[PDB]
């Protein structure tokens, strides 16, 4: 409660904080809705408090660019300090200043266009497993829970790309467990009581069950791995989360959009049959040829950017684009709110892949649309992820069409907790094109 | 208990730590004796743990110089992080990296030879008050408790030099209280439980009774003050501690040595009567003329360096003079042990002012003898303090001689707690020279 006057003092509007809690009660509508309501009432810049942590929200593209790009190494180097992290402090997305640079450099080649082309033949093999497992639930006629099949796929791909362990997760429900081993109760407390984090740290009770962590090095025998003692595995733990949840979630969002916009699904499928003809197998070169696929993926990432917020800690008193940022304030770029802002988007709530057509993509600001972040600390896996999703999308759409059920939640609702994911799992009728 | 193998791993000998406690139980003989025993058994370099804080002790002059002087701004910038500090974080002796530099620069002029000469007439006036208050207890014939009279003097000088408030503390026992408002119970706990410091911080219960702290700004009306909102007073809080305790303590040590070495007391007094004749008043120029006075003060500071230890935190993994210092280890220079080391001192336990005679002072290593520290972060008040003590010594010795009582503790013993001070207060017969 020592900072609660900070935004008053700076002239920065925002919701009035409560002692100890700050504004965290406002989150009862979800992170994303809080951000949108705040943008609506307060304007371009506002401040609020996560417990006692002042957070400054910025929506001006120039200032976003200054924060993510220009003044990154100097001022905005790290994300918000989190609670019990333990050895996971060595994670590339957790490391701060030095060590990060090291990890980042030590890993940037592992995500070069070169390795991806080398991995495209590999991950394509789980597309077929996916098609067959799809054709199984399809022939039954019963609705399909996309998260389950896509999850199995995503898990299959990340395990092979990161270790070479080739498994059929959906058909081998038993590495499968260990990874599958995965709301906001203690977390809230850790926010209001950040002073208990060091206690939690010394008890060796990090957030993860750190018993599969032994399993990982116990399974690190001596792909992402061959492209390289305990910190080594800490990076791969981050890769699995990315490769599994975010990928499968985004895949479910896209299929939801495709099933609810048949014309879009048909056009995409026409693009996939023009390219890649006769259910031909997708390659690295072929994917980068499919323009409408890129627009569909991009639109969906506009509607549903699974990171929701971009965040950087101000390391020193600075003044950027005419406003003073005191040391220690977290600067938040509310990507979700920005993706749905009518200032930058006509009918922001409408799915409209044409926004991203070669004509219209120009009039789109790269600091307003930030599905993968920006500047030095952006998503190192963006290319890998897009390819992985596109490859999935192509093979599935080469063989199946997707339709709403009685069971499908329309309009989809977002989950109320702290992850960008559907309220109800996406469930769709799947019909074979043959 | 996560670092307890660190010195094993580095090849660095030391006392075996205990989980959670480290080696703090070894302190039962006092900081200083622990350091001496360790130096005796382990050699030039050893390591130990204050709870979980690894501390590396170095005794090689070259490496000390590298730590205090060469690699200060780069590696060894700050002292050990302490427990609940609160606003007192703004203190020059607590501030770290930046802010320190600022304070240090913002205060270095306040301790220039120039202001001291301006303050010498001022502080000389409390020498006379001291003489008279001395002549009072003297005429009674009863033994004198040097800490009480010297304390009143030290308090009188620091209050006038830092604010201009001229008071007769000994004769006005009622600012007097507020400052006078001044063992190791919770402290030990805070060492073994550093994880509770942030708790203690958020409760606004800093170590000081922070009610006289209001009094200070309530008495900061708008000397050290005129040579210049809340941090301003935080520096003056540090000045009072220095001006009061350390000065009065060192004065008591010196008088103890003088009373126990009559020949030394007589020689000094001959030097004061040769200079400054006929109980003439001491001036800035006169003081710097008295060579034997400088040797007596210096010898006593060898025997009793009230800081006992010098300490710097290693900010980054470095390798100095052929040994690797991991980040976060406190590097400790055990001044007390070094001042009493037979490698550098003949008969180190003997009081021998001649060690510091113009002939012998040359063969004395400035990194072995560090009563005021060294390099950028040394005692900013060294000159002020020496002048203050010397002025006191001169006026007192111009009028009185000092002798042991039945009541005097001979040989003096050092207090067992964490301050360098006598076990029993020094008590001496005081006889008037007239
Ligand atoms: C649809 C899939 C994904 C999306 C939308 C996504 C989005 C993001 C975003 C918005 C950030 C933060 C950027 C910033 O701070 O400016 C990020 C960071 C990161 N992502 Fe992804 N991501 C995805 C998948 C992946 C994948 C597949 C990988 C690796 C295999 C990955 C690895 C990382 C890493 C390591 C970081 C932290 C970068 C750093 O700390 O320097 N992500 N991602
Ligand atoms: C006999 C009297 C004194 C002795 C023996 C003494 C000794 C020391 C020592 C050993 C240090 C640490 C040096 C290092 O870290 O290398 C120190 C620091 C310091 N002393 Fe003194 N001191 C005395 C009196 C004073 C006085 C009278 C003042 C001011 C009026 C003062 C102000 C300071 C300050 C501000 C620091 C911290 C410097 C910094 O953080 O940059 N001291 N002193």
Swiss-Prot record, chains A, B:
Activated by cytochrome b5. Expressed in prostate and liver. According to some authors, it is not expressed in brain. According to others, weak levels of expression are measured in some brain locations. Also expressed in epithelium of the small intestine and large intestine, bile duct, nasal mucosa, kidney, adrenal cortex, epithelium of the gastric mucosa with intestinal metaplasia, gallbladder, intercalated ducts of the pancreas, chief cells of the parathyroid and the corpus luteum of the ovary (at protein level). It catalyses: an organic molecule + reduced [NADPH--hemoprotein reductase] + O2 = an alcohol + oxidized [NADPH--hemoprotein reductase] + H2O + H(+); 17beta-estradiol + reduced [NADPH--hemoprotein reductase] + O2 = 2-hydroxy-17beta-estradiol + oxidized [NADPH--hemoprotein reductase] + H2O + H(+); 17beta-estradiol + reduced [NADPH--hemoprotein reductase] + O2 = 4-hydroxy-17beta-estradiol + oxidized [NADPH--hemoprotein reductase] + H2O + H(+); 17beta-estradiol + reduced [NADPH--hemoprotein reductase] + O2 = 16alpha,17beta-estriol + oxidized [NADPH--hemoprotein reductase] + H2O + H(+). One of its GO terms (cellular component) is cytoplasm. Its main location: endoplasmic reticulum. Pathway: Steroid hormone biosynthesis; Cofactor metabolism; retinol metabolism; Steroid metabolism; cholesterol metabolism; Lipid metabolism; fatty acid metabolism. Heme binds at residue 379. Polyubiquitinated in the presence of AMFR and UBE2G1 and also STUB1/CHIP and UBE2D1 (in vitro). Its cofactor is heme. It is a single-pass membrane protein. It is an enzyme of class 1 (oxidoreductase). InterPro entries: Cyt_P450 (IPR001128), Cyt_P450_CS (IPR017972), Cyt_P450_E_CYP3A (IPR008072), Cyt_P450_E_grp-II (IPR002402), Cyt_P450_sf (IPR036396), Cytochrome_P450_3A (IPR050705). Interacts with PGRMC1; the interaction requires PGRMC1 homodimerization. This is Cytochrome P450 3A4. It comes from Homo sapiens (Human). The gene is CYP3A4.
């Amino acid at each position: 409660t020592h900072s609660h006057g900070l935004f008053k003092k700076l002239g920065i509007p925002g919701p009035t904080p409560l002692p100890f809690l700050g504004n965290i009660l406002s989150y009862h509508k979800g992170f994303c809705m809080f951000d949108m309501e705040c943008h609506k009432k307060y304007g371009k810049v506002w401040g609020f408090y996560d417990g006692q942590q002042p957070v400054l929200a910025i929506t001006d593209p120039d200032m976003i660019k200054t924060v993510l790009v220009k003044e990154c190494y100097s001022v905005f180097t790290n994300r918000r300090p989190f609670g019990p992290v333990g050895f996971m402090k060595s994670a590339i997305s957790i490391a701060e200043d030095e060590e990060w640079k090291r990890l980042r450099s030590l890993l940037s080649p592992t995500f070069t266009s070169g390795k991806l082309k080398e991995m495209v033949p590999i991950i394509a093999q789980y597309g077929d497993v996916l098609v067959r497992n799809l054709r199984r639930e399809a022939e039954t006629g019963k609705p399909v829970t996309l998260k389950d099949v896509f999850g199995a796929y995503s898990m299959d791909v990340i395990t092979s790309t990161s270790f070479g362990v080739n498994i059929d997760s959906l058909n081998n429900p038993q590495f499968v467990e260990n990874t599958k081993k995965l709301l906001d109760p203690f977390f809230l407390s850790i926010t209001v009581f950040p002073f208990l984090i060091p206690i939690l740290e010394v008890l060796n009770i990090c957030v993860f069950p750190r018993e599969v962590t032994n399993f990982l090095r116990k399974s690190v025998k001596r792909d992402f791995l061959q492209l390289m003692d305990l910190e080594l595995v800490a990076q791969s733990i981050i890769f699995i989360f990315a490769g599994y949840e975010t990928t499968s979630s985004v895949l479910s969002f896209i299929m939801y959009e495709l099933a609810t916009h048949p014309d879009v699904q048909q056009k995409l499928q026409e693009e996939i049959d023009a390219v890649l003809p006769n259910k031909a197998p997708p390659t690295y070169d072929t994917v980068l040829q499919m323009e409408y696929l890129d627009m569909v993926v991009n639109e969906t990432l506009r509607l549903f950017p699974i990171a929701m917020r971009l965040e950087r800690v101000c390391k020193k008193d600075v003044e950027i684009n005419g406003m003073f940022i005191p040391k220690g304030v977290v600067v938040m770029i509310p990507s979700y709110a920005l993706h749905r802002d009518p200032k930058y988007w006509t009918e922001p709530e409408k799915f409209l892949p044409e926004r991203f057509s070669k004509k219209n993509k120009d009039n789109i600001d790269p600091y307003i649309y930030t599905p993968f972040g920006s500047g030095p600390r952006n998503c190192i896996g963006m290319r890998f992820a897009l390819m992985n999703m596109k490859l999935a999308l192509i093979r599935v759409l080469q063989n199946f069409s997707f339709k709403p059920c009685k069971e499908t939640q329309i309009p989809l609702k977002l989950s109320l907790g702290g992850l960008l994911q559907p309220e109800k799992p996406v469930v769709l009728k799947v019909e074979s094109r043959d």
